[PDB]
Amino acid sequence: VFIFDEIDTFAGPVRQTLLYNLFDMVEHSRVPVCIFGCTTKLNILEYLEKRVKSRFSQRVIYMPQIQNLDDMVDAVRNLLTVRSEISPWVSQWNETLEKELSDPRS
Amino acid sequence: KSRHTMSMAPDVTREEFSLVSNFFNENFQKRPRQKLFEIQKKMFPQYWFELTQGFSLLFYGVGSKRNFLEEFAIDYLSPKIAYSQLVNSIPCLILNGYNPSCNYRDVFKEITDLLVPAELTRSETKNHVILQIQKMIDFYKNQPLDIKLILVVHNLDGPSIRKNTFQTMLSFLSVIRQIAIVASTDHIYAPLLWDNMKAQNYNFVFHDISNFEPSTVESTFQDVMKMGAEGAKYVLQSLTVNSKKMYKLLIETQMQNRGTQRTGVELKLFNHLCAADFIASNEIALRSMLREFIEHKMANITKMEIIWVPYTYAELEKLLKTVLN
Amino acid sequence: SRFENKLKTTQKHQIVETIFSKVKKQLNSSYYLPARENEFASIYLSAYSAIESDSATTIYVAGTPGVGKTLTVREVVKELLSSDFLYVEINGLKMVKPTDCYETLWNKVSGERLTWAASMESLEFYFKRVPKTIVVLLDELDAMVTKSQDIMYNFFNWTTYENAKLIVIAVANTMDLPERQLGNKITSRIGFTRIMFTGYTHEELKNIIDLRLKGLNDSFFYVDTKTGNAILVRKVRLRMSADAIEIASRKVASVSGDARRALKVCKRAAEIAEKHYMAKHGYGYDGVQTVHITHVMKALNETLNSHVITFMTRLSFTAKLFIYALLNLMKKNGSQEQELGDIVDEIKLLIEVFVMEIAKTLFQQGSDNISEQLRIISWDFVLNQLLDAGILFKQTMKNDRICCVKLNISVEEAKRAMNE
Amino acid sequence: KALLQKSSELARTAEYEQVMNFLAKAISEHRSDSLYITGPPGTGKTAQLDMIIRQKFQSLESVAVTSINCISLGEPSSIFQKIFDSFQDLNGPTLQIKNMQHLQKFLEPYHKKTTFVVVLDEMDRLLHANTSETQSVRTILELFLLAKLPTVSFVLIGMANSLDMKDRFLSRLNLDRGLLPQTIVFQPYTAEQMYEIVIQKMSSLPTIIFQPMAIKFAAKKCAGNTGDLRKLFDVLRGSIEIYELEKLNYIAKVFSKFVNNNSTRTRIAKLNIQQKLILCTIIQSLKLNSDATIDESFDHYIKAITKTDTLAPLQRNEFLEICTILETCGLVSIKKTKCKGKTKRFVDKIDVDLDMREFYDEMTKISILKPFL
Amino acid sequence: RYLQPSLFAIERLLAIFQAIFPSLMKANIEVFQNLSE
Amino acid sequence: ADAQRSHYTVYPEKRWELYHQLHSHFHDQVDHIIDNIEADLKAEISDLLYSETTQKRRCFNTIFLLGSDSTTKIELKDESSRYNVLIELTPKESP
């Protein structure tokens, strides 16, 4: 498994060699591989040239965002709530959390 | 702005220029030139006497001094001083300043080998140039006073010697008593080169020599528009025979109307014109042997789709009657 | 060679070979050709003559990537092993420095490691002295041309020696390459063979798919109903609708004519039906099946459709507040490139031209003790967030007022996505 | 039928007669004429001198005259190393091959006093090397100086493509100095000396080696822009396999590859009527002759399609794919050009190989682009 | 007097220098000395 | 002939004696005065470089040699059980 952070900087103008070798390893190698590019430059596909993009399997996946106000409210509830029993305070602590969270005027 | 220009001049080829130039510089003012050369010959004992005092002798004046320095340094002085100290005579190290390829490292690598390698000075070789010459200086303060070397620096305002890290290098050489420094400059702003720091190290004295010499060697590296209309004059002499004809049809209607943009021709009709005389098959076969006129910058294009020749009105009819015909 | 013995491990716990697993095994890009059938001969008959006559020639082929020129010349030499030569894949892009290919050649004649300098001396000493057979592939020639053409002159000057036992095969990106990068002195040595490779056509793009689908199209699998494992309790079949394969062909031949792009869009569309089949029954990982036309409709569109429009409407408020200010200046001035201080000048002005509960929060997160902010809250943050997203672009200056800002996506779609 | 055409693909020239006059002292062991041999490219000129010296060495007295190729040096030392390789000896090499004066010590022979002439192959790599009047012209200057007093002189034979090199010489050197004078050129042989060599290179003659007037036709209608007729027989050797593949026919096959799409196959590239619309959209954006982005084109594409409602406005992502359909046929090229705000940043500027004259014909047949013009 | 200074060339100095000096001077060797000083 | 090559080396009184007894005798008075200021400049740096015991003792001692010709050489004390080194930095070596 390949883990690539900031693969856009490898996608420079001049050489692009290292991308070209791993993407051809998809095509021919008996060793099963998988490549994982992580970046933040959105239109990553135009940054590549022609001969590398044809090696590429073209499948990108966009990462989601918090699209509604209710979503992160649901997230912070799952974030702060403890579910496993450790402390005597826990059952008291869990209902204090949501009571602040359920009230929209809190 | 009707200006007469060097393009509108009766030009002269390569062999025609240099031969008649060689006629003047060896026959114009020959009698008074050696008549000057015999007059200044009596100053030669005076230079010998002052040069024992370690004085950096500097020659200014109009005209080239290159011939005069080489007579004065080689034939006159360098065996005269060897005879007066008492065996090979004193080594002469000239420096051609008009040659731009002079560096500070290479000439000083000659110097420490010209001077005595009495110690392991390669141990101090590690910019150690000012460091290595400083260890040379203080040792030379306590040596017996005699000249062992005379160096000549022609054209001290030259393109490489006038660089400032090289100038200070020569400054520390001149304070040493064992070497005599006989140099010449030609610039009118040559005393801009030195402050009272360097001239303290230099103790320059000055003498006029004006023989109005032509500077044969010193003209070679220099260039003007004598040295393109003349550039593409030679490429057409070695090509295919069809390119002569398609340039002839090019040059006619481009001179039908200086040779500027407005006299030029459109690409479509010129394709049809060079299709009319059974020359151009199509656009690609036209353009490919037109890129060869483009690659050697023999024609221009601006925007009709105007291709025009960048040579003058007078030049194209010269290109007509001589090389095309 | 060595370590492939060490790349093997033992415990392989019975991986589920589902219905669409056996498709992707042959839909792998590895394993006579229909489309470039006669041009295979045009290479080979150009190659067969020089091989059996001990000469030195040059063969120049061009074309867009995805047309088989990586493939076809491998099929040339492959049959030739049956009937005197040393095969090397001198790839251009697989060389780190351009001079490093020189090391390979001197390595691949005797087995010595010498410098790029010392190799080409003995290479030149080889190519004009040996009494009397080398096949070399100079792939992806855009890489080895870049510096000063002194490398490229060598690779064809060796061909000129009549005592040079070498056969070169150049494969480029464009036919134009010895006319817009090289000199004419190389262009004399390149020859005028110039075998052009076009794209593929959509009829042949059907004829390339079924070569992978030879023994598996409309065939039968043996399946247990409990694990989803398929074997070449039911005995099920799986069919491929050829019209959807056709509409895959009529797009890829239209835009690119690329043989990887045709296979991979079928490969992407194959796994869409894989997860929907796993969604309905859940066999995990431990009557008659098909692939609809609706799969390749999505996956071909999945090559096209974006998200920056969906990204922009799912951004923060002050992000959408920022761009709406930025288009306001671009229709005020018509200069498409506005100074950064004027934007901060505008977002102040776009307040006073619920808004107060906004304007309280927009410059301080509540807090009477620490209010009175000049520029807005997290203004460095959203401008950094719009920068690394690629939507915006900001030139570098230590002044944080007169540094110019330029848009990077089309401003109309920025205007259009703002409307939501 | 193969073995007659298997042998097809492989004193002799009428230029060798010139150079023996130019080497008139090379058989009397004296210093010959002054040899600077130039040429337009492809004219056989590399192998031309190689033909002479190989005929010289196979003919010729002690025999040692060496030739080295100036390709991978950029520097004037190891040439004087390679003349030492004909000696098979051992010495202190580095200093002797570096300085002008160091070459002079190297020119005292050992066994029988046969004079030496060097041959400098491909001199134009050092001519068209690093900056002229600093190193390379000085390198040119230093080699051509033959002021040595014995007749054992390092006579140069150097070669070049482009004929600017003589005017590059300094005015001292052009005063009849060294080997510069005899600027022996080689005009490209139309058919009148090169084809006849092909005749004598058909010594082993098959029966049907084709109507030779068509070979004469091949020579006459290739001599517009050419220099190498064996290589232009190597395009006959490809067409001679065409008559083997089918068990100037090929120049006809190769030019239609290049001439088309502007006249006819433009509409082949744009079977989509929207591809006809998007092609005129590019040229309407070319009024502002700027870095023609894919966005500024998309700007003019939307703001016109809202005025005339010929189609719905499509996506930018669709606009990405459709312009690449215009790309692979070879009409418009896309390059990542320069904008220098933050870093070297790459926006895409396009360029079209069509003219408005070849546009206006193919749009008056379709009145749906007529609103757009 | 407040603004940043303009750019010279050579001999414009000696243009102004010959004017403002107390024909009383003509030798310019020491004048060229003090420039690089 | 060779003048375009740079720096090629090659290997080709009743009154005046009364000058000779006067010139060097004068020059013995010159250089002896020259070492006087040379001993003067070397002295006044040396005592002032030492014996300055400040109380904070977390500051370097600086010395401004006004009016100096940028060539003033310095010698140092031996001062055993401690090495004392001299570093010079010319504006040519200040990039």
Ligand SMILES: Nc1ncnc2c1ncn2[C@@H]1O[C@H](COP(=O)(O)OP(=O)(O)OP(O)(O)=S)[C@@H](O)[C@H]1O
């Ligand atoms: N006619 C064909 N028959 C079978 N498989 C093919 C055919 N054409 C292409 N392929 C497959 O598709 C892949 C595409 O690679 P190629 O087209 O050979 O490479 P390419 O055309 O040189 O593109 P590059 O290498 O980036 S320039 C090949 O490796 C094969 O697996």
Ligand SMILES: Nc1ncnc2c1ncn2[C@@H]1O[C@H](COP(=O)(O)OP(=O)(O)OP(O)(O)=S)[C@@H](O)[C@H]1O
């Ligand atoms: N007249 C000829 N006689 C014999 N062989 C010839 C003749 N003309 C061409 N050839 C051969 O065909 C080749 C074509 O010339 P090229 O080598 O391509 O050009 P060139 O020899 O490099 O000269 P250039 O381009 O100016 S360096 C020659 O090298 C010879 O092998």
Ligand SMILES: [Mg+2]
């Ligand atoms: Mg290859």
